[PDB]
Symmetry: C3
Subunit: 258 residues, 3 copies
């Protein structure tokens, strides 16, 4: 069942651990590195400089490590990096960084990126994230761990999707989504916290209730942004889980000297 | 002159009626059955167990019969079934069922499914439906006959699109769409009935007027849901066409004992 | 370092200037003409009658010059035309015209059409336009020069996107967008003029201020449409830039005899 299909193209410069597979008609461009036990499906296109970790499954029609088309980037020799145990479904596009930001697009471990999703220049994904069909990260988007972006979720240049956060389908996210928050619609608004994926992480009930309290503070008490960050302080010493939520909201607003 | 391109891959286990064609670089995975007079374009990917009926036209970059990525499904050996005279345009994805629901994703006859559309695990399509570009059925979605989903229509797990119904472009359907109803926007709201595709079916004028009356009852009289189902009763004996509309609304709301 | 890959398929009827390149597994259907210095990536599909100008870059999974699926078109032998210095990113679909309108889909010069974008039957694109990821022109859409459609912008049959206009991401454009106007959301509303791409064109400050005045007139003074066209008259003699804006608004409303 013999590993690297002969109908596939591998650059001499590319370099692949022993038990990597490549389906037919797939291209492994120059400067592409593929870690142990990874599988490249048929009709894939890898371009470098790109570093793909161990035990990844990448499917057909996927164009992983292409240049961003954005005119900003004029071909400077930037990187893409993918961790281990990731799944990249049919037709996904992942673009390498631009020198303008950190010169690298980056994906962690255990992520599920479903069909026709896009991950633009300089975006950065943590672990156990799910990007559903046609989710699109315009560029320099940071997605912290466990986040779930429902189908056709759109995320504007530079937004931070905090951890365990959740976008509903057709969400149009123009600004940061705090840890644990559920957001919906065009343009994205906050609704609740994601109690779902909190029970899934086996959070204590005190921690859940405390996170509801925390939501209520920010949003439904109309404190200012600053006013609420202040309130949470207590809540956040008490519960590392809340801490995260305060910390998300923190480094979204620095504001100016009024 | 030559039917099945030599550059295409056909599993020994696959089985294809005499005058089937397959374009180059297309893969017909194991357990894939293709009925009389069907045409598979170039760069297609079929995976099984999948049964494709007669006189279908499937285009390039289409991944028909892949497993749903949803973690729910752990590889149990489920099915896809496609009827006759269907068209599947460029880049369509169709996923086979999960044992959790009916273990089968199902498509009827005479359907037009346009480019980059998605038909998730366990979805079920009738006949003469049109799914326009990038329409997406999250899973277990039933689309009854003649329905038209305009481009980039999104349909949440388990929703029923009643017959002759119509979604506008970028519709975000979170709940059932009754027979004949036009819905628009994010989130989808009702606007009118689809008089268009009623004239197309050559409905009697009494039947059209009766269907307007019926709409008005449900929606624009603010009867309850139950209250309206009651009203329609008369309307629905009188006109098989209305009957359908009542029947759609019926088995969307069972409610609980208050 | 010999230009047309041997694993690619070229119709004898197709015709390609000397220094054209074609990547592997790409098909150049009959009646396809490709101008000097153009590059066709791997796994592309060209179909004709199609005329592609000079120095274009077309990427993988792109299906350029296929028939529109719309049932309106019954195979009449219509055309696609693409100018020079265009970029067509991964997975783009471009459909040839229908005899019903002008029998031709048309693209000018220096345009950037990003991944998974769609350009339906009879649409018409000027120069230096950017269509971002998954932008979709349903059909007979005219996009005048310098226009920018942010990602997942949807444009209903027959709309005119005036020059330097700008749609935000997930915009759902059901009606004309005047020159220079910024529109956002579902359904698209007007917000501002696109001062951005005005500074980019090096417009005089008088011209910018005059264009703000002009916006204010149409929209924020609630003159009628006709009433405002009247006002602009002066503004529009004075400034060719305004002229454009009046002219966009003009041939969107002919109205009827009341
Ligand atoms: N609101 C809501 N609740 N459950 C869901 C499912 N889901 C998100 C999801 C979560 C986990 C997972 O594995 N897949 C999808 C979606 O994005 C629904 S929309 C969708 C799903 C699959 C394919 C394409 C689309 Cl548009 O949506
Ligand atoms: N408002 C409205 N009424 N009819 C239309 C056309 N249509 C629906 C349609 C009708 C017939 C058919 O054969 N295909 C699509 C659309 O989906 C419009 S949006 C669209 C069309 C083609 C590709 C992609 C998109 Cl976003 O738009
Ligand atoms: N409001 C706003 N202003 N600029 C933007 C960014 N932009 C447009 C853009 C403009 C020029 C260019 O070369 N690339 C992107 C977008 O399409 C944002 S959404 C996006 C971008 C790239 C891929 C996919 C998506 Cl959804 O959004
Ligand atoms: Cl709440
Ligand atoms: Cl409380
Ligand atoms: Cl009505
Ligand atoms: Cl009446
Ligand atoms: Cl009324
Ligand atoms: Cl020029
Ligand atoms: Cl110019
Ligand atoms: Cl440009
Ligand atoms: Cl014209
Ligand atoms: Cl002034
Ligand atoms: Cl004002």
């Amino acid at each position: 069942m013999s590993l690297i299909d002969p109908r596939a193209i591998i650059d001499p410069s590319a370099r692949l651990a022993a038990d990597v597979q490549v389906g037919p008609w797939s291209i492994v461009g120059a400067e592409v590195e593929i870690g142990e036990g990874t599988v490249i499906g048929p009709h894939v296109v890898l371009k470098g400089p790109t570093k793909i970790g161990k035990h990844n499954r990448i499917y057909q029609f996927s164009s992983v490590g292409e240049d961003t088309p954005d005119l900003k980037y004029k071909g400077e020799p930037t990187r893409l990096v993918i961790g281990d145990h990731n799944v990249i479904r049919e037709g996904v596009t992942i673009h390498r960084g631009t020198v303008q930001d950190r010169a690298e697009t980056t994906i962690g471990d255990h992520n599920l990126i479903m069909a026709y999703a896009h991950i633009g220049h300089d975006s950065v994904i943590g672990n156990h994230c799910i990007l559903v069909n046609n989710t699109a990260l315009a560029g320099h988007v940071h997605v912290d761990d466990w986040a779930i972006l429902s189908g056709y979720t759109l995320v504007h240049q530079y937004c931070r999707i905090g951890a365990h956060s959740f976008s509903g389908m057709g969400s149009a996210i123009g600004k940061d989504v705090p840890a644990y928050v559920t957001v919906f619609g065009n343009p994205a608004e906050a609704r609740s916290m994601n109690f779902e994926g909190m029970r899934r992480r086996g959070f204590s009930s005190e921690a859940i209730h405390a996170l509801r309290r925390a939501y209520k503070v920010v949003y439904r008490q109309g404190h200012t942004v600053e006013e609420a960050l202040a309130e949470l302080a207590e809540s956040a010493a008490q519960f590392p889980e809340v801490a995260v939520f305060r910390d998300s909201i923190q480094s979204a607003t620095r504001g100016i000297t009024r």
